[PDB]
């Protein structure tokens, strides 16, 4: 398809998130909203805050409805809480429709709004099962589909720059596209390969094999989905279950041993810097994640480059060095295919057919020698067994 008005409607970067412009209330109050496939609540700052340039003023909206109910959302490092209500919502560079949706007006938060991120709310695109307070609070996308004829699917092309962007550059640049209700062929190359959404809560999938430069990690595949495996645009890193993480890092270190990096680099805590333009991409291996296909006993793989898993960070120093952080870290809640992974591909969240498609992104960062890839099919047996219970 071709949904030209929605192409390039995102701004942001992997470390801080990608967001789309939305309006809430009457008259319209414009806000920048983080696109998050890892959660299911539509929530916006509703009170002044040091890191918010603007916020939702319910008292100024004539269509605001109070649901007289509070909502609390805690997470690893911080949280937000607020008051539930509904209002009219639109997406300026989205389909030309206006919907009444649940809105969590954030009254208090800790380590939620990030300095300089520029988004003032979050758009939880996942399913009702994980919405807060409970699954009766209908998610935004569900209200959108119910109230309009927008097809039940959206697609995301998150575009990392491959280098640090200052405040001015993020504001003045295109960070990608969120095509609501369709697929735009200019956003990818090659073919789209689909993997089933295992269950509708998070956008859960099943990984059946992992390779580091073609070499099989060779772990029992259930380890790869230990707990669950999800696609999450609201998380920066590629997160891996502890056992998988330890095996992956051992292998990545082995492939890159011509250079040694401090432990803090591998812990994703400290940056590594190389003189301008000399980042040794070639010593780092590519990483392939094989996903269960739609055809019985068939699988396909997506391959990412170090240009995806090494996240650019500015060297606040006065050097012209190119610096990065290792964007692969351990998880205790399963595999998380975050932003640095999504930056390599055009990702289709086909809710209507309960599947997620992957294609090489037309804007993925690469070099002259290697490119990210999506290839298949591969004959694979007993993949259902890779799922955890």
Active centre residues (catalytic): 36, 232
Three-class secondary structure of residue 290 per DSSP = strand
Tokens of 223: 């380890």
Query: 200: Cβ–Cβ under 8 A, 6 or more apart, which residues?
Result: 127, 129, 351, 354
Cα–Cα distances in angstroms (integers) from residue 323 to residues 158, 272, 304, 320, in the given order: 21, 6, 19, 9
d(CA 117, CA 108): 18
User: Of 159, 221, 230, nearest to 381 (Cα)?
Assistant: 221
Tokens of 75: 């997470």
Q: Is 197 exposed, middle or buried (0-12, 13-18, 19+ CB in 10 A)?
A: buried
Instruction: Count the alpha carbons within 13 Å of 228 in the hemisphere toward its beta carbon.
Output: 14
d(CA 33, CA 26): 18
d(CA 372, CA 366): 7
Q: What's the CA dihedral at 154, 160, 165, 171 to 10 degrees? A: -20
**Angle subtended at Cα 155 by Cα 150 and Cα 157, rounded to the nearest 5 degrees:** 145
Tokens of 118: 């520029």
Tokens of 23: 């309006």
Sheet holding 207-212, edge to edge: 215-216, 207-212, 287-292, 298-304, 373-379
Per the CB < 8 A criterion, the answer to whether 338 and 240 are in contact is: no
What letters, b where the CB count within 10 A reaches 16 and e where it falls short, cover 254-265?
eebeeeeeeeeb
């Amino acid at each position: 398809g071709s949904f030209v008005e929605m192409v390039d409607n995102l701004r942001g970067k992997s470390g801080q998130g990608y967001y789309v412009e939305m309006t809430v209330g009457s008259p319209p109050q414009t806000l920048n909203i983080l696109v998050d496939t890892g959660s299911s609540n539509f929530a916006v700052g509703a009170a002044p805050h040091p890191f918010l340039h603007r916020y939702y003023q319910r008292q100024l909206s004539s269509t605001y409805r109070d649901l007289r109910k509070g909502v609390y959302v805690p997470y690893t490092q911080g949280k937000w809480e607020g008051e539930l209500g509904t209002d009219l919502v639109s997406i300026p560079h989205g389909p030309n429709v206006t919907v009444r949706a649940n809105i969590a007006a954030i009254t208090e938060s800790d380590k939620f709004f990030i300095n300089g991120s520029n988004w003032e709310g979050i758009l939880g695109l996942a399913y009702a099962e994980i919405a807060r307070p409970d699954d009766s609070l209908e998610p935004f996308f569900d209200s959108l589909v119910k109230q309009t004829h927008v097809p039940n699917l959206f697609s995301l092309q998150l575009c990392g720059a491959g280098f640090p962007l200052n405040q001015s550059e993020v504001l003045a640049s295109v960070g990608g596209s969120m095509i609501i209700g369709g697929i735009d062929h200019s956003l990818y190359t090659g073919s789209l390969w689909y993997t089933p959404i295992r269950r509708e809560w998070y956008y859960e999938v099943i990984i059946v094999r992992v390779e580091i430069n073609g070499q099989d990690l060779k772990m029992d595949c259930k380890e790869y989905n230990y707990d669950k495996s999800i696609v999450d645009s609201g998380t920066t890193n590629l997160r891996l279950p502890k056992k998988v993480f330890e095996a992956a890092v051992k292998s990545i270190k082995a492939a890159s041993s011509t250079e040694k990096f401090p432990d803090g680099f591998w812990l994703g805590e400290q940056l590594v810097c190389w003189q301008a333009g000399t980042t040794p991409w070639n010593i780092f291996p590519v990483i392939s994640l094989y996903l269960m296909g739609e055809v019985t006993n068939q699988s396909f793989r997506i391959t990412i480059l170090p240009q995806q898993y090494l996240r650019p960070v500015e060297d606040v120093a006065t050097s012209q060095d190119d610096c990065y952080k290792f964007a692969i870290s351990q998880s205790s809640t399963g595999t998380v295919m975050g932003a640095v992974i999504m930056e390599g591909f055009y990702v289709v969240f086909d809710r209507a057919r309960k599947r997620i498609g992957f294609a090489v992104s037309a804007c993925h960062v690469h070099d002259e020698f290697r490119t990210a890839a999506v290839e298949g099919p591969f004959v694979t047996l007993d993949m259902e067994d890779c799922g955890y219970n």
